[PDB]
RNA sequence: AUUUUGUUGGUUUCUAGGACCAUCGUAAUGAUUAAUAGGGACGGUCGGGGGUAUCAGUAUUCAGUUGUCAGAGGUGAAAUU
């Protein structure tokens, strides 16, 4: 039927990355980052910015015979927050209205069974 | 050692006295509770109680392979990087 690659959504709170792979993972088909559309740091995880940054990927996937993807959204999670970033909701609304098939959605957020200390200190970030 | 042998040393038998040792007989012969104190034993347990080994888990970082290409990182905004 359709042919899937993987859109490996990574949207932290300062930027978004929408990066789509073969199914295996191995080969890079389009990687274009919030930051590559805005000159402004502030905005680089914006959803106006994930939204065009989707679009450039998704149009490159077409010339390349993707039709359909499934989604792989991930947090930065380790120590860090495992909520994902703002850019991340739109990446995924902007290539399924870019005429991209949907396959399979997923949150792969890396997750510890516990582990290494946060940054921060004890008293945490005093603002 | 309490008396007397006319008498003082006496003298050791004698007398009597505790103090024990044995036998027999008397006797209802002789051991207070087990504290909703405690201690101990025992029986099924119950615990992220402790110690010594042992087996996971993903994560973090670093490294090896790869794949693409312009930014990545970080903030309230930036910059050092
Ligand atoms: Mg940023
Ligand atoms: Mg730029
Ligand atoms: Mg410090
Ligand atoms: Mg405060
Ligand atoms: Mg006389
Ligand atoms: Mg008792
Ligand atoms: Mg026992
Ligand atoms: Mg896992
Ligand atoms: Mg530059
Ligand atoms: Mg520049
Ligand atoms: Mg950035």
Known sequence: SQVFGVARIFASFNDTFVHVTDLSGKETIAR???????????????????????????????????????????????TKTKTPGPGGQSALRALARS?????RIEDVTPVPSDSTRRKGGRRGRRL
């Open 32 to 78: 274009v980052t919030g930051g590559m559309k805005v000159k402004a740091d502030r905005d680089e995880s914006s959803p106006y910015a994930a939204m065009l940054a989707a679009q450039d990927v998704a149009a490159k996937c077409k010339e390349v015979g993707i039709t359909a993807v499934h989604i792989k959204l991930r947090a930065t999670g380790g």
């Open 99 to 103: 005429g991209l098939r949907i396959g």
